[PDB]
Design a protein around this nucleic acid. Sequence first.
RNA 1: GGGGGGAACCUGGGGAACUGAAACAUCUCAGUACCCAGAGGAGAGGAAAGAGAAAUCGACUCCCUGAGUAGCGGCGAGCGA
RNA 2: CUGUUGGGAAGCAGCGCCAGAGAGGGUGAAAGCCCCGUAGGCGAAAGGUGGGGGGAUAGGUGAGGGUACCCGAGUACCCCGUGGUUCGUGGAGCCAUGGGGGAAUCUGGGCGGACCACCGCCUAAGGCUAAGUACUCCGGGUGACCGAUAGCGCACCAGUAC
RNA 3: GAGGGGUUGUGGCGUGCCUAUUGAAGCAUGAGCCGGCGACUCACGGUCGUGGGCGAGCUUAAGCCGUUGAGGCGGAGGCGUAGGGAAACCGAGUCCGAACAGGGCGCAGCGGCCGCAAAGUCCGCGGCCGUGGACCCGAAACCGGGC
RNA 4: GGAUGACCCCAGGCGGUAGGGGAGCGUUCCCGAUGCCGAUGAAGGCCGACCCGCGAGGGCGGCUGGAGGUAAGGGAAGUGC
RNA 5: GGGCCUGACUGCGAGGCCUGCAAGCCGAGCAGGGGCGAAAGCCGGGCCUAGUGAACCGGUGGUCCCGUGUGGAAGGGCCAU
Lengths: 64, 202, 149, 59
Amino acid sequence: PKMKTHKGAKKRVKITASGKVVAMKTGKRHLNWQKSGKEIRQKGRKFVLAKPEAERIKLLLPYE
Amino acid sequence: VYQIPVLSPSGRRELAADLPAEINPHLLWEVVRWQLAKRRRGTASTKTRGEVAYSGRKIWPQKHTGRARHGDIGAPIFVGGGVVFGPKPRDYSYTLPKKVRKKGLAMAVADRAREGKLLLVEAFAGVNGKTKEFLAWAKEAGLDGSESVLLVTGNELVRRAARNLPWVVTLAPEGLNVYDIVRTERLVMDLDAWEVFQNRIG
Amino acid sequence: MKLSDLRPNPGANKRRKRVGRGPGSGHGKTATRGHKGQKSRSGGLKDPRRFEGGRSTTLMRLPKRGMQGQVPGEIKRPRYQGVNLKDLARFEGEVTPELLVRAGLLKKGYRLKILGEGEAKPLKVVAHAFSKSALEKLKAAGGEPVLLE
Amino acid sequence: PRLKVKLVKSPIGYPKDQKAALKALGLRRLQQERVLEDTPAIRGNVEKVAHLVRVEVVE
RNA sequence: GGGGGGAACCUGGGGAACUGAAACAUCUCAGUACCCAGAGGAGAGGAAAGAGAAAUCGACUCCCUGAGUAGCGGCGAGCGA
RNA sequence: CUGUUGGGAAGCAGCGCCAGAGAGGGUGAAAGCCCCGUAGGCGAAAGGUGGGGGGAUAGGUGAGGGUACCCGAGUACCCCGUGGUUCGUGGAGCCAUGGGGGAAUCUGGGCGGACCACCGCCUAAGGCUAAGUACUCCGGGUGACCGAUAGCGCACCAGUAC
RNA sequence: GAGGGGUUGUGGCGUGCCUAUUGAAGCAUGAGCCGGCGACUCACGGUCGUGGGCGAGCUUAAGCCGUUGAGGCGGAGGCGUAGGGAAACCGAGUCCGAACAGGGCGCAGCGGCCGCAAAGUCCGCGGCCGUGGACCCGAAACCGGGC
RNA sequence: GGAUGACCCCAGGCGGUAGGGGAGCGUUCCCGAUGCCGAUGAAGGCCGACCCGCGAGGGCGGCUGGAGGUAAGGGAAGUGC
RNA sequence: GGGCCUGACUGCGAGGCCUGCAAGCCGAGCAGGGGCGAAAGCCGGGCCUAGUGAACCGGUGGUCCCGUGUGGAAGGGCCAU
Ligand SMILES: [Mg+2]
Ligand SMILES: [Mg+2]
Ligand SMILES: [Mg+2]
Ligand SMILES: [Mg+2]
Ligand SMILES: [Mg+2]
Ligand SMILES: [Mg+2]
Ligand SMILES: [Mg+2]
Ligand SMILES: [Mg+2]
Ligand SMILES: [Mg+2]
Ligand SMILES: [Mg+2]
Ligand SMILES: [Mg+2]
Ligand SMILES: [Mg+2]
Ligand SMILES: [Mg+2]
Ligand SMILES: [Mg+2]
Ligand SMILES: [Mg+2]
Ligand SMILES: [Mg+2]
Ligand SMILES: [Mg+2]
Ligand SMILES: [Mg+2]
Ligand SMILES: [Mg+2]
Ligand SMILES: [Mg+2]
Ligand SMILES: [Mg+2]
Ligand SMILES: [Mg+2]
Ligand SMILES: [Mg+2]
Ligand SMILES: [Mg+2]
Ligand SMILES: [Mg+2]
Ligand SMILES: [Mg+2]
Ligand SMILES: [Mg+2]
Ligand SMILES: [Mg+2]
Ligand SMILES: [Mg+2]
Ligand SMILES: [Mg+2]
Ligand SMILES: [Mg+2]
Ligand SMILES: [Mg+2]
Ligand SMILES: [Mg+2]
Ligand SMILES: [Mg+2]
Ligand SMILES: [Mg+2]
Ligand SMILES: [Mg+2]
Ligand SMILES: [Mg+2]
Ligand SMILES: [Mg+2]
Ligand SMILES: [Mg+2]
Ligand SMILES: [Mg+2]
Ligand SMILES: [Mg+2]
Ligand SMILES: [Mg+2]
Ligand SMILES: [Mg+2]
Ligand SMILES: [Mg+2]
Ligand SMILES: [Mg+2]
Ligand SMILES: [Mg+2]
Ligand SMILES: [Mg+2]
Ligand SMILES: [Mg+2]
Ligand SMILES: [Mg+2]
Ligand SMILES: [Mg+2]
Ligand SMILES: [Mg+2]
Ligand SMILES: [Mg+2]
Ligand SMILES: [Mg+2]
Ligand SMILES: [Mg+2]
Ligand SMILES: [Mg+2]
Ligand SMILES: [Mg+2]
Ligand SMILES: [Mg+2]
Ligand SMILES: [Mg+2]
Ligand SMILES: [Mg+2]
Ligand SMILES: [Mg+2]
Ligand SMILES: [Mg+2]
Ligand SMILES: [Mg+2]
Ligand SMILES: [Mg+2]
Ligand SMILES: [Mg+2]
Ligand SMILES: [Mg+2]
Ligand SMILES: [Mg+2]
Ligand SMILES: [Mg+2]
Ligand SMILES: [Mg+2]
Ligand SMILES: [Mg+2]
Ligand SMILES: [Mg+2]
Ligand SMILES: [Mg+2]
Ligand SMILES: [Mg+2]
Ligand SMILES: [Mg+2]
Ligand SMILES: [Mg+2]
Ligand SMILES: [Mg+2]
Ligand SMILES: [Mg+2]
Ligand SMILES: [Mg+2]
Ligand SMILES: [Mg+2]
Ligand SMILES: [Mg+2]
Ligand SMILES: [Mg+2]
Ligand SMILES: [Mg+2]
Ligand SMILES: [Mg+2]
Ligand SMILES: [Mg+2]
Ligand SMILES: [Mg+2]
Ligand SMILES: [Mg+2]
Ligand SMILES: [Mg+2]
Ligand SMILES: [Mg+2]
Ligand SMILES: [Mg+2]
Ligand SMILES: [Mg+2]
Ligand SMILES: [Mg+2]
Ligand SMILES: [Mg+2]
Ligand SMILES: [Mg+2]
Ligand SMILES: [Mg+2]
Ligand SMILES: [Mg+2]
Ligand SMILES: [Mg+2]
Ligand SMILES: [Mg+2]
Ligand SMILES: [Mg+2]
Ligand SMILES: [Mg+2]
Ligand SMILES: [Mg+2]
Ligand SMILES: [Mg+2]
Ligand SMILES: [Mg+2]
Ligand SMILES: [Mg+2]
Ligand SMILES: [Mg+2]
Ligand SMILES: [Mg+2]
Ligand SMILES: [Mg+2]
Ligand SMILES: [Mg+2]
Ligand SMILES: [Mg+2]
Ligand SMILES: [Mg+2]
Ligand SMILES: [Mg+2]
Ligand SMILES: [Mg+2]
Ligand SMILES: [Mg+2]
Ligand SMILES: [Mg+2]
Ligand SMILES: [Mg+2]
Ligand SMILES: [Mg+2]
Ligand SMILES: [Mg+2]
Ligand SMILES: [Mg+2]
Ligand SMILES: [Mg+2]
Ligand SMILES: [Mg+2]
Ligand SMILES: [Mg+2]
Ligand SMILES: [Mg+2]
Ligand SMILES: [Mg+2]
Ligand SMILES: [Mg+2]
Ligand SMILES: [Mg+2]
Ligand SMILES: [Mg+2]
Ligand SMILES: [Mg+2]
Ligand SMILES: [Mg+2]
Ligand SMILES: [Mg+2]
Ligand SMILES: [Mg+2]
Ligand SMILES: [Mg+2]
Ligand SMILES: [Mg+2]
Ligand SMILES: [Mg+2]
Ligand SMILES: [Mg+2]
Ligand SMILES: [Mg+2]
Ligand SMILES: [Mg+2]
Ligand SMILES: [Mg+2]
Ligand SMILES: [Mg+2]
Ligand SMILES: [Mg+2]
Ligand SMILES: [Mg+2]
Ligand SMILES: [Mg+2]
Ligand SMILES: [Mg+2]
Ligand SMILES: [Mg+2]
Ligand SMILES: [Mg+2]
Ligand SMILES: [Mg+2]
Ligand SMILES: [Mg+2]
Ligand SMILES: [Mg+2]
Ligand SMILES: [Mg+2]
Ligand SMILES: [Mg+2]
Ligand SMILES: [Mg+2]
Ligand SMILES: [Mg+2]
Ligand SMILES: [Mg+2]
Ligand SMILES: [Mg+2]
Ligand SMILES: [Mg+2]
Ligand SMILES: [Mg+2]
Ligand SMILES: [Mg+2]
Ligand SMILES: [Mg+2]
Ligand SMILES: [Mg+2]
Ligand SMILES: [Mg+2]
Ligand SMILES: [Mg+2]
Ligand SMILES: [Mg+2]
Ligand SMILES: [Mg+2]
Ligand SMILES: [Mg+2]
Ligand SMILES: [Mg+2]
Ligand SMILES: [Mg+2]
Ligand SMILES: [Mg+2]
Ligand SMILES: [Mg+2]
Ligand SMILES: [Mg+2]
Ligand SMILES: [Mg+2]
Ligand SMILES: [Mg+2]
Ligand SMILES: [Mg+2]
Ligand SMILES: [Mg+2]
Ligand SMILES: [Mg+2]
Ligand SMILES: [Mg+2]
Ligand SMILES: [Mg+2]
Ligand SMILES: [Mg+2]
Ligand SMILES: [Mg+2]
Ligand SMILES: [Mg+2]
Ligand SMILES: [Mg+2]
Ligand SMILES: [Mg+2]
Ligand SMILES: [Mg+2]
Ligand SMILES: [Mg+2]
Ligand SMILES: [Mg+2]
Ligand SMILES: [Mg+2]
Ligand SMILES: [Mg+2]
Ligand SMILES: [Mg+2]
Ligand SMILES: [Mg+2]
Ligand SMILES: [Mg+2]
Ligand SMILES: [Mg+2]
Ligand SMILES: [Mg+2]
Ligand SMILES: [Mg+2]
Ligand SMILES: [Mg+2]
Ligand SMILES: [Mg+2]
Ligand SMILES: [Mg+2]
Ligand SMILES: [Mg+2]
Ligand SMILES: [Mg+2]
Ligand SMILES: [Mg+2]
Ligand SMILES: [Mg+2]
Ligand SMILES: [Mg+2]
Ligand SMILES: [Mg+2]
Ligand SMILES: [Mg+2]
Ligand SMILES: [Mg+2]
Ligand SMILES: [Mg+2]
Ligand SMILES: [Mg+2]
Ligand SMILES: [Mg+2]
Ligand SMILES: [Mg+2]
Ligand SMILES: [Mg+2]
Ligand SMILES: [Mg+2]
Ligand SMILES: [Mg+2]
Ligand SMILES: [Mg+2]
Ligand SMILES: [Mg+2]
Ligand SMILES: [Mg+2]
Ligand SMILES: [Mg+2]
Ligand SMILES: [Mg+2]
Ligand SMILES: [Mg+2]
Ligand SMILES: [Mg+2]
Ligand SMILES: [Mg+2]
Ligand SMILES: [Mg+2]
Ligand SMILES: [Mg+2]
Ligand SMILES: [Mg+2]
Ligand SMILES: [Mg+2]
Ligand SMILES: [Mg+2]
Ligand SMILES: [Mg+2]
Ligand SMILES: [Mg+2]
Ligand SMILES: [Mg+2]
Ligand SMILES: [Mg+2]
Ligand SMILES: [Mg+2]
Ligand SMILES: [Mg+2]
Ligand SMILES: [Mg+2]
Ligand SMILES: [Mg+2]
Ligand SMILES: [Mg+2]
Ligand SMILES: [Mg+2]
Ligand SMILES: [Mg+2]
Ligand SMILES: [Mg+2]
Ligand SMILES: [Mg+2]
Ligand SMILES: [Mg+2]
Ligand SMILES: [Mg+2]
Ligand SMILES: [Mg+2]
Ligand SMILES: [Mg+2]
Ligand SMILES: [Mg+2]
Ligand SMILES: [Mg+2]
Ligand SMILES: [Mg+2]
Ligand SMILES: [Mg+2]
């Protein structure tokens, strides 16, 4: 039958207009007291996933 | 525009018609394929090793008999076991694009037109039901049976009269199709059917 | 054109790849699966789009973000699909969401909003909303905006 | 469509109200060229001084 | 009047495990297999103490779509209106 | 129909003919016109069916004003324990109910996802109802379905022998 | 019947097949021999490539009608035509921000109106992926109901 | 070169497991076929030192066999041990 | 060693190092508002290289973004921890 959307991907990622994959930086969920503002600030921005990993998650998202 | 010869009691007529200029053999093939594919019955079937009559008992122990290990005798490695990837019932039909089958229809009629083998008839003089009547008409109309003919006309009495001839196929214009056009060597049509064909390709 | 003339164009109907059928073919014995391991097996291999040999997956180490929602589900709200001025140039006189949906530009059940890529034609256009540049371009080219609800 | 309007014939000797049209259209110099909308208002001025103006439709 | 039978099909009362989660317990398989009771040529359902946002619709059943959407989920595998 | 070759003609030749019938199977080989059939037509005393057509019957039927009599009880409702739903305790409503408590009859009650207000929707605790849907033991029709290790386990005295 | 066929005395050379392996003639696996059966498929969805139709559009589904190896109707809906943001929201932009800052993610054919081409989309075909038993055969076991 | 496989000349490459690509052969079935081959002998079988093809294979001939087989071109798969 | 101080900043970040991924590292410069210095300038912790832990689930302080007919609320989101 028809493929099912991976809801973990859907809730963690977004396909852009040209088909890149974008996610939030990891590593600021906790343990943040001794992290510089430089770390907390740069980890608040999205980033583009490496291509091999991006093409995988994109197949998990077939009706976006 | 092509110039299609017309047949009348009032004389040998001619009439311009707007069949397409360039004919696409691959396109015609796609309509005939799709015609002959969606009519398939799809009734070929076989029995999976689970659809077979034997029981799922292990025919002998896994080890220490000195024979190969087997499970049940429904396995396809056994004579009389199931068949691995046999036909199951299938629907071979598919929605060939409407625009494509419309194009092919006009295209296939144009090929007969571009050949000289498209005749348009006003009516059918004496033929009111009998084969001998239509045959006689065919002799006046230049149809001697040396070539196969697709008769397209809404007149049923004419259709029944011709249909048993071995060289004539019989259609109501709602049944105009490219496979039957290509099967045949000539194409013969009512001006009533011709109008219908002209509407369906518009 | 006889039945025997109907052939597909070159390349229209390529033949299949039939493996496990002898040495000459290039595909005998192992049927291009190589030797042993998972994946050579019937059914083999977990789904390679996700699984990574047991370690935490590339997807699952990324953080979630945003509103996923909750039962009883989506909150029904007015929805806007925007249509550009360039898409309107084909029309004459008056433009309406009705006419816009039949053209193929606007999707049903979506409130209209005019956007400003392209130029504005003098058209009385009835839309649920306009961008700033849509109003200005329109009401400066003889256009006649009509906000509604 | 817009209006590429070029002033190609001196207004000198023509009625004052035609010279006003040029001021409405912004044509203040010979060979000077302004692109405007096709508004029926703007069009009529361009039509008034049609004999002094080269006009190309744009867009 | 009942009793018993009938290949599949139907409703109700009970109801697993292998398996999947590359371990496993919630979860999955699955209200499936099976057992039982009842019904028939079908059975269930059915004439709003409904839907749910339309100032709207108008019994129920069945198909297409909605939609792998909304959501549910050791927010895992998956499940899924 | 005749000739012809041949064990045999339906083959080959000659001259015809039918067709609303040139689907198919037979016949000594390959037959439209020999046979069985095919197109197109007809057919029930008896049993069954009859959802179509007709006829009976049951049944169906106003307006204001007054009155406040009635409108389904261990029920609604709340709490405890669960199930159903996409909903795994979740902000958890809704539907159902094993335990406890326990109403009202319209100015009554349930619902619109905790709850409250406003605004709407509906009228629980009685019952029945064709059709559209499912299935194939049974009959028939048809296969780019099998052709005896295939196709049903069984083409054959098979759920048999063993 | 100036060539060929059968046979083989002598001379030269010469470590079966398959499988598994770093390495097998291997004293590692399988096979007595013959004949027959025997393993990469199908559905749906995806993703690339390909043959055509149409092209800012493309396409129908269930059904309905027609045929009885006839084809047509049906636009509900789906994909595309705009993205950015958790969202409200804005929009060729948008989000972060105090910013007109900086950045992330986005935004624009070939030849003479005419012709070809093309976004996209539909169908066919092919490779591959997902769900299914999913290339075939094989457990020891687990459970249910019965004997 | 001649002009798009029209064929010719000249030059270079051409060991190969896993594996990628390409081009073909053959099998069953369908269209082609109300046709065509067929008792002056179908398919299948048995030979052949003959012809074609690199090969898979395809012809042709002789015997057997005694009723089927099926082209050029395409289509589909229970397709090669 | 001493004086004054809190840049152990907020909003970003050209460009690189490293690297399968995900991480890790260095970073000029612009803006806000500051510290020190007459000033040139320096300052986004510590001579440097160890002192660390992805996601999921939840806590707390903000934000006032969503709020299941409507206004609120319940509950989420976003920022920080
Ligand atoms: Mg499913
Ligand atoms: Mg998740
Ligand atoms: Mg996102
Ligand atoms: Mg964490
Ligand atoms: Mg946080
Ligand atoms: Mg900490
Ligand atoms: Mg800090
Ligand atoms: Mg530190
Ligand atoms: Mg810092
Ligand atoms: Mg950092
Ligand atoms: Mg920040
Ligand atoms: Mg690669
Ligand atoms: Mg995808
Ligand atoms: Mg995908
Ligand atoms: Mg979609
Ligand atoms: Mg079968
Ligand atoms: Mg079978
Ligand atoms: Mg089975
Ligand atoms: Mg079995
Ligand atoms: Mg069985
Ligand atoms: Mg049995
Ligand atoms: Mg069994
Ligand atoms: Mg058993
Ligand atoms: Mg068993
Ligand atoms: Mg053993
Ligand atoms: Mg032995
Ligand atoms: Mg054995
Ligand atoms: Mg044996
Ligand atoms: Mg055994
Ligand atoms: Mg077995
Ligand atoms: Mg046995
Ligand atoms: Mg079995
Ligand atoms: Mg069998
Ligand atoms: Mg199988
Ligand atoms: Mg099998
Ligand atoms: Mg297919
Ligand atoms: Mg014919
Ligand atoms: Mg005929
Ligand atoms: Mg006929
Ligand atoms: Mg015919
Ligand atoms: Mg007919
Ligand atoms: Mg017909
Ligand atoms: Mg022809
Ligand atoms: Mg190939
Ligand atoms: Mg194929
Ligand atoms: Mg294949
Ligand atoms: Mg081979
Ligand atoms: Mg070989
Ligand atoms: Mg290959
Ligand atoms: Mg190889
Ligand atoms: Mg081998
Ligand atoms: Mg291989
Ligand atoms: Mg491979
Ligand atoms: Mg492999
Ligand atoms: Mg492979
Ligand atoms: Mg292998
Ligand atoms: Mg190996
Ligand atoms: Mg290997
Ligand atoms: Mg192997
Ligand atoms: Mg290995
Ligand atoms: Mg391996
Ligand atoms: Mg292995
Ligand atoms: Mg391997
Ligand atoms: Mg593989
Ligand atoms: Mg691999
Ligand atoms: Mg293998
Ligand atoms: Mg298996
Ligand atoms: Mg699997
Ligand atoms: Mg496996
Ligand atoms: Mg681990
Ligand atoms: Mg959402
Ligand atoms: Mg002048
Ligand atoms: Mg003057
Ligand atoms: Mg003058
Ligand atoms: Mg004047
Ligand atoms: Mg009993
Ligand atoms: Mg019973
Ligand atoms: Mg039940
Ligand atoms: Mg049950
Ligand atoms: Mg139990
Ligand atoms: Mg279990
Ligand atoms: Mg278990
Ligand atoms: Mg497991
Ligand atoms: Mg496992
Ligand atoms: Mg285990
Ligand atoms: Mg388990
Ligand atoms: Mg469980
Ligand atoms: Mg299962
Ligand atoms: Mg399973
Ligand atoms: Mg379950
Ligand atoms: Mg059940
Ligand atoms: Mg069952
Ligand atoms: Mg019925
Ligand atoms: Mg009923
Ligand atoms: Mg009632
Ligand atoms: Mg009621
Ligand atoms: Mg009502
Ligand atoms: Mg309803
Ligand atoms: Mg109403
Ligand atoms: Mg009704
Ligand atoms: Mg549905
Ligand atoms: Mg949708
Ligand atoms: Mg669930
Ligand atoms: Mg699940
Ligand atoms: Mg569930
Ligand atoms: Mg479930
Ligand atoms: Mg439901
Ligand atoms: Mg004789
Ligand atoms: Mg005779
Ligand atoms: Mg003969
Ligand atoms: Mg004769
Ligand atoms: Mg017939
Ligand atoms: Mg027949
Ligand atoms: Mg016949
Ligand atoms: Mg016959
Ligand atoms: Mg004959
Ligand atoms: Mg015959
Ligand atoms: Mg006959
Ligand atoms: Mg009849
Ligand atoms: Mg009859
Ligand atoms: Mg009758
Ligand atoms: Mg009646
Ligand atoms: Mg009534
Ligand atoms: Mg009354
Ligand atoms: Mg009541
Ligand atoms: Mg009651
Ligand atoms: Mg009571
Ligand atoms: Mg308790
Ligand atoms: Mg409760
Ligand atoms: Mg619950
Ligand atoms: Mg549930
Ligand atoms: Mg539950
Ligand atoms: Mg709940
Ligand atoms: Mg209770
Ligand atoms: Mg009262
Ligand atoms: Mg009330
Ligand atoms: Mg009340
Ligand atoms: Mg209630
Ligand atoms: Mg309640
Ligand atoms: Mg309530
Ligand atoms: Mg409600
Ligand atoms: Mg509410
Ligand atoms: Mg209601
Ligand atoms: Mg009730
Ligand atoms: Mg009933
Ligand atoms: Mg019914
Ligand atoms: Mg039958
Ligand atoms: Mg029968
Ligand atoms: Mg036999
Ligand atoms: Mg048998
Ligand atoms: Mg035999
Ligand atoms: Mg067989
Ligand atoms: Mg039977
Ligand atoms: Mg039988
Ligand atoms: Mg047998
Ligand atoms: Mg037998
Ligand atoms: Mg017996
Ligand atoms: Mg010799
Ligand atoms: Mg010799
Ligand atoms: Mg000797
Ligand atoms: Mg020797
Ligand atoms: Mg030697
Ligand atoms: Mg040796
Ligand atoms: Mg070998
Ligand atoms: Mg080994
Ligand atoms: Mg070894
Ligand atoms: Mg050995
Ligand atoms: Mg040995
Ligand atoms: Mg040895
Ligand atoms: Mg050994
Ligand atoms: Mg070994
Ligand atoms: Mg071996
Ligand atoms: Mg032996
Ligand atoms: Mg043996
Ligand atoms: Mg032997
Ligand atoms: Mg053998
Ligand atoms: Mg494959
Ligand atoms: Mg299959
Ligand atoms: Mg697909
Ligand atoms: Mg594909
Ligand atoms: Mg494609
Ligand atoms: Mg098309
Ligand atoms: Mg269309
Ligand atoms: Mg017919
Ligand atoms: Mg978004
Ligand atoms: Mg920007
Ligand atoms: Mg801001
Ligand atoms: Mg900016
Ligand atoms: Mg940019
Ligand atoms: Mg084109
Ligand atoms: Mg295309
Ligand atoms: Mg793939
Ligand atoms: Mg299995
Ligand atoms: Mg399966
Ligand atoms: Mg597969
Ligand atoms: Mg167990
Ligand atoms: Mg156990
Ligand atoms: Mg045990
Ligand atoms: Mg046990
Ligand atoms: Mg037991
Ligand atoms: Mg037991
Ligand atoms: Mg050479
Ligand atoms: Mg070279
Ligand atoms: Mg090589
Ligand atoms: Mg067949
Ligand atoms: Mg035939
Ligand atoms: Mg002959
Ligand atoms: Mg054969
Ligand atoms: Mg032979
Ligand atoms: Mg040969
Ligand atoms: Mg001979
Ligand atoms: Mg022979
Ligand atoms: Mg015969
Ligand atoms: Mg024959
Ligand atoms: Mg043959
Ligand atoms: Mg053939
Ligand atoms: Mg061929
Ligand atoms: Mg296929
Ligand atoms: Mg096979
Ligand atoms: Mg092949
Ligand atoms: Mg072979
Ligand atoms: Mg100090
Ligand atoms: Mg100070
Ligand atoms: Mg960088
Ligand atoms: Mg990196
Ligand atoms: Mg570090
Ligand atoms: Mg500063
Ligand atoms: Mg300063
Ligand atoms: Mg100072
Ligand atoms: Mg300074
Ligand atoms: Mg700095
Ligand atoms: Mg987890
Ligand atoms: Mg959270
Ligand atoms: Mg707070
Ligand atoms: Mg609310
Ligand atoms: Mg608010
Ligand atoms: Mg309020
Ligand atoms: Mg509000
Ligand atoms: Mg809040
Ligand atoms: Mg919050
Ligand atoms: Mg919160």
